[PDB]
Structures are given as C-alpha cells and as structure tokens.
C-alpha cells in the first residue's frame, strides 16, 4: 500500500513543481498599468416579489428576459423580468429545492434537492400547463446544481461526491463523474458545453470533459468548502467562492489560481458568483446579505449591491449582460442595472 | 399605456399571485417537525405510530392539526451543508434510547453530543426540541443489574428507575445553552406509544402559542 501512497505524493510534488515553473508573473503584475473601473453603483430597477420563503436558486433564460427562481416554499416561479409578471408558477413534489435550471432553448426547466431527484418540467405543452417531463433518479444524496446542455441532456452534481450527465429521454444517467472527496456543491458548464467544472466540499475544484467522462484537472487553494463556481465568459478561466470568505480565479491552461479576492471587512462565506458579459466584473453574493462587485483584473471592491435583508443566496447576469438578478433568503429577487 | 395582450398577461400574473398567497396561507398553518436521532434510537418506532435514500416526508392529521414530519437521517452527506434548510421547522423531535448505557464501542454520549449540536446550532436557536426517550422497559429491566456508572462517571443518588430517568433528563436538558430562547419538552414513552402522538400535539401547541405570543408582541 505504501508504495502507491508514495507514488501519489511524488505525483503531487511533480505537478506542484510544474505549476511553480509556469508561474512567471501573476495577473496582478500584468494588470498593473490598466485603469480601474469606476465606482459601480447599481440601482434596484425591479424587485421581484411573491416567493414565500428562502430563494435557493435562480437562472436566466437565453432571451435575457425570462428567469426561473426556485424557493423552499415549494415553488418554481418563471418571471418576466421586464414587467415582473409571473409567467409560470410550478408546484414541486418536494419543497426542499436547492437548485434550478433553465433550458437554453427555453422549453424546459429543471430542479432538484434533498430528494436526490432531478425533475424536468416541460413548459411548451399543448395542454397549457407545466408538467413533469422526467424524474432523474440515481444519486444517493441531495442535488446541488443542475445545468442543461440540450433539451435532452442535463448534467447534475449531487452531495454524494459525484456528478452525472443524463439522457432525459431515456431517463438514465449515461455518464457518471467520480473523484471528488466531499459533497459536490456547485457546477458550471463551459460556454461551448464540452467541459464543465465542479466544486465540492473538499475545497477542491475539478474540470471534466462531458464526453470523455473523466476529470482533466484539479484545482486547489481554498481552505474551506466551495459553494459556487462560474466560468469566465471566454471559457479559459473560472472563479470559485468558498466558505473561507474569499473568491479565487483559476485558468485552465495555467492550471493554477491566477488571483484571489480576499478582503478585510468580509469575514463570511460566498454563496454565489457570476462574471459580467465582458468578464471585467466579478459579482459575488455573501452570507452578510450584500453582493460585492469586484474588478476581476485588479480585485478592487468596485461596488456593493446592498439591498437584501437575509443571507444572499443566488445571482446571475443576463446572457446579454444588461442586468444582474440577486435572490436572497428574504424571499425577494432584485434586478440591478 | 399597455396593449391588450400585456393586460391579459398582467391578469394572469395576478392570478398566479393569488394562488401563491392562498398556498402560503396554508403552508404557515401546517406544523413542520424535523425528526432526528441515532441509527436505531427509535425513529422507525415513532414513525410507525405517526404513520397512521433522500428526505422522507410523512404527513398526518391529528386533532384537526396537520403535521409534516421530515425524517432526514437517511441522508449520508455533510450535515452542515443542508441543515440550514430546516430553520423554520416548528420543532425538532429527537429520539434517544435509554437501553444504550452498555452499548459501548458510550453511544449514549454520542447521543448527547448530537443533542448538543442540535440545541446550539445557529439555525435552531429559536426552534424547540421534543425529546423522546424511548425503550423505557428495556431500561427499567436493565437498571436493576447494570448501574448508571457503567456509562456515566457519576450517577444519581441511587440506581433507582425513576431517579435514573430524572437524572438522564436533567443531563440532556442541561446541554441547552440557550434556555432563555428555546425550551425542551421531554417524553418517556415506555412503548406506550398511543400517547406519543398526543404528546407531540401538546408540545407543538405550546410551541405554536409561544410563537404567536412573540409575533403579536405579548411575550
């Protein structure tokens, strides 16, 4: 047994040495002379209300107008962000929903949670009511995140250390991603959807190729569990937030953390993160009910979206970057622009 | 100002809002009890009367009061990553077995350790606890030949059935670090399970009332 453990330690040392060898100059040094962004003040253009309990997840439609929000009162509400009208209200079989997703085509939504089942809801039915298209079972723990690739493929990470790519039409998982040490808390698809990154409670993140079915790279640097991930819009980098109260940015090819977003005032964990369309701004929701907008190139606390009473929970910028929605435990989603 | 289609959409949105309000007025009324305990403490036993790999919900109406009981012990995952979902539960039922003195690898101390965490979590400061101490008969029969000292460094004044039970209750209640904000209701079901549900109906009432007294400002 000891020989394989020594081999693993040797491989870890070798990869650490390679990463150090590649670290010629950090991003902060490279970004020294570029001018900072101004004080990013954002007003609450719309306050979406109607949810009765904590908002636990939300997602934007590709049209940048419709958005689905999931709450623990047992409701998925599809809102029209422009007018704040409820487009749909979907009751759930289990009110313990921890995540939700919007199909890129806009036809389907999905959700899951402590029931360990990913329920897919079809919105374009001829009956005129939203009905469960499929219930994906096979995970032995709560679902932490769900993301659509097509109308027939969904990738879901669970709290039993595994992720899975499913064929919705067949109803069974076609690929299973394993290798994490702790509960997989967050997941993010690449812009091209060929790769996706998962963050787990073991403080590590892992990059997976959806078709190859095996992790390609492992990223470390957080001292606590990771609660959120997002892809830098270019798809060559991703930012993660953790309970250690600092966000971090990694580049896939460099295979190490380029920058860190620690702060003095902030002493609490991060629940969600999102990059702005240009990628210059990184938005992150915190446990102290205020989202912070960071200059992703300089890590300056460029702005604060302080408008929530209870722990900030989820947020997302529209696919066209026109606005950012933040849902929080006080049962309100606020849209900022 | 608006198109006809926009006005119809607004009407539909307000219909959805009315439905949401109507369902919320129903969710608040329902009692929600989080069930917890050791692997074989008696959760199955109690569920078997209140019955009349994810979260297991069981619904039952007793004396025109609707209870949803969430048995989550089936989940083998990081507790601190999903426990906060149960902030608003009316109460936490906690099952512990009194025949656990001799089940060393000490399991009684494991039960007290779990009880400490449940009492003193950030989330459950205001959430009351209903402590079901089960299997009294297997403890009444056992105390006569296995003293409390086998598990605890110090025991009651004597290895007497009632004194031992009271001593166990006192220790379990003393783990409450927030006596000013929450109360622990204790039961001693000796397989007299017909009373169990009634107890939960009683204790829960004392919780519900003490919540309303807080909402209207009397407390």
């Amino acid at each position: 047994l000891d020989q394989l453990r020594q081999e693993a330690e040797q491989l870890k040392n070798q990869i650490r040495d390679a990463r150090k060898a590649c670290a010629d100059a950090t991003l902060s040094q490279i970004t020294n002379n570029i001018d900072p962004v101004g004080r990013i003040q954002m007003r609450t253009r719309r306050t979406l209300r109607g949810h009765l309990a904590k908002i636990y997840a939300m997602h934007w439609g590709t049209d940048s107008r419709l958005l689905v929000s999931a709450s623990q009162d047992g409701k998925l509400i599809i809102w029209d962000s422009y007018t704040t009208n409820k487009v749909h209200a979907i009751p759930l079989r289990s009110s313990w929903v921890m995540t939700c997703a919007y199909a890129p085509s806009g036809n389907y939504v999905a959700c899951g949670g402590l029931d360990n089942i990913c329920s897919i809801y079809n919105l374009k039915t001829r009956e005129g009511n939203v009905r469960v298209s499929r219930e994906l079972a096979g995970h032995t723990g709560y679902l932490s995140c769900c993301r659509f690739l097509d109308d027939n493929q969904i990738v879901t990470s669970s709290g039993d250390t595994t992720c899975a790519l499913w064929d919705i039409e067949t109803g069974q998982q076609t690929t299973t991603f394993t290798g994490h040490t702790g509960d997989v808390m967050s997941l993010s698809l690449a812009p091209d959807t060929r790769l996706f990154v998962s963050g787990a409670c073991d403080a590590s993140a892992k990059l997976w190729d959806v078709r190859e079915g095996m992790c390609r790279q492992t990223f470390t640097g957080h001292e606590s569990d990771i609660n959120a991930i997002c892809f830098f819009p270019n798809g060559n980098a991703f930012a993660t937030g953790s309970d250690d109260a600092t966000c971090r940015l990694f580049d896939l090819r460099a295979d190490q953390e380029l920058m860190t977003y620690s702060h003095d005032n902030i002493i609490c964990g991060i629940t969600s993160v999102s990059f702005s369309k240009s990628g210059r701004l990184l938005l992150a929701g915190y446990d102290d009910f205020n989202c912070n907008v960071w200059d992703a190139l300089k890590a300056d606390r460029a702005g604060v979206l302080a408008g929530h009473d209870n722990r900030v929970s989820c947020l997302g910028v529209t696919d066209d970057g026109m606005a950012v929605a933040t849902g929080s435990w006080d049962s309100f989603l606020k849209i900022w622009n | 100002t608006l198109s006809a289609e926009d006005k119809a959409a607004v009407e539909r949105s307000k219909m959805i809002d009315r439905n949401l309000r109507e369902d919320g007025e129903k969710a608040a009324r329902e009692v929600k009890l989080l069930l917890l305990g050791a692997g074989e403490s008696g959760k199955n036993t109690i569920v078997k009367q209140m019955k009349i790999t994810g979260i297991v919900e069981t619904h039952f109406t007793f004396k025109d009061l609707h209870f949803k009981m969430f048995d989550v012990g089936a989940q083998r995952s990081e507790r601190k990553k999903w426990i906060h979902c149960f902030e608003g539960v009316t109460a936490i039922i906690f099952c512990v077995a009194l025949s656990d003195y001799d089940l060393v690898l000490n399991r009684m101390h494991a039960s007290m350790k779990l009880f400490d965490s449940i009492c003193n979590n950030k989330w459950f400061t205001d959430t009351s606890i209903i402590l079901f101490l089960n299997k009294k008969d297997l403890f009444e029969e056992k105390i006569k030949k296995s003293p409390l000292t086998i598990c605890y460094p110090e025991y009651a004044g004597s290895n007497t059935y009632e004194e031992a039970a009271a001593y166990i209750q006192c220790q379990f209640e003393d783990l409450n670090k927030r006596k000013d904000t929450k109360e622990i209701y204790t039961h001693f079901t000796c397989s007299t399970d017909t009373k169990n549900v009634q107890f939960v109906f009683d204790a829960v009432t004392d919780v519900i009332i003490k919540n309303n007294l807080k909402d209207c400002g009397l407390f």
Partner: single-chain antibody
Amino acid sequence: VQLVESGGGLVQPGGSRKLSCSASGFAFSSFGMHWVRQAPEKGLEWVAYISSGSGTIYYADTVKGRFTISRDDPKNTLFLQMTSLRSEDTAMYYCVRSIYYYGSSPFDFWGQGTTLTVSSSDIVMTQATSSVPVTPGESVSISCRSSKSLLHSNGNTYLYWFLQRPGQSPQLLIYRMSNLASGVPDRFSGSGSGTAFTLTISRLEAEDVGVYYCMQHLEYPLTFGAGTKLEL
C-alpha cells in the same frame, strides 16, 4: 386537445338561445376563451371574449348587451346566452382558446363550430384581393393593411394570420406577424411594416388552398379581414 360546440339549429327572429362548448384535453381553467362568428358566406367576426377566472369579459359592439358569455371551469364548459336574436346573427360559431403570457400563442386552437340559423372607431383591416390563383409547387404572397399601426411601444406587432380550409375550422398560422404556430410547416412566413403586412408561402402544397384571414390584437374590439381565397 379537443373543443366541441353544441346547441346549433334553427331559431326564430328575436328569440333567445344558449350555445355551449365542452373543453377537453387541456387545462380549460387557465385558458381565456373567445366566441367568433362567421356569416354563412362572408368572413369571420369576433363575438366575445372571457379571460380565465372571468376577471375580464368583452363583447363586440354588434352584440354587446344582447349576448352574454360565461364559463364553468369545474365542468370545463363555456356558454353563450343570446337574447333578441336578429337575422344578422345567423352564422357558424367557433370557440377559440387563448392563453396570454410572454411568448404565448393565443387563438392557437379552434373548435369544430356550431351552426345557428336565424329564420326569416375600430381598427379597419383590409386584404388585397378576395381570390388568388395558385398551383402546387409555386410561391404565393398575400397582403394586408390596417387602419392603425399595430407596432406597439413594447415592440410587438400584433398581427395574426389564420388559414381556413373548406369545411374545417380556422387554424392559427402566424401570431404577432412573425411567429409560426406549433405544427405549421416552414412553408409559411410573415412580415410587415407596422401598418402594411404580408404572408408568404413557398413550395405551396395541396391542402394549402382555402381562405386566409388576418386579425389584429392591439385593441380589444378585434377585427378580421375580408379573407383571401387561394384555389388550385
């Protein structure tokens, strides 16, 4: 999905009657409903509308006060009471469902129709021609014009294109002037300039022949066109 009207037959001028249609195969409780009439030979004419939950009930000035629309969601039925009938009321009557929300497709489904034989400021919509000749495999366009610009401030151009084949109920082809309805082949397309619109068919196929009707949904007194006939 299925809509079936009943209560048809002959009626005496100036009397009263009930029509009803039974909704099936869909959540009638959530859909708004329309009654639309068609004189024996001439084009469609909007009769009445009831929004889901009966929160909104609108009538055409031609019938307002004489007709009354109602719905029974528990029985999934729609009713139309009529009093003081006149010769102008003799017509086929269709029930059309319509669900209104962002991206919805109102007027998608039409009932079979019930015949009622009576014994013996609005937006004006015009269509270019009463008839147009066509043959299979050809490309054919149909024009339309409106009294007011349908392009609303919110950017939606509220024009609808329906096709009625001889003997069948009208079917929604295009909604809001560019959006093809579900099940409509790619042959059909639509465009317009706010006040002038057009619908085009490529590789025209058999069974496409019939009457093409326009409709505006910018203002509640909905108005149809004269109908353009396409024949082999």
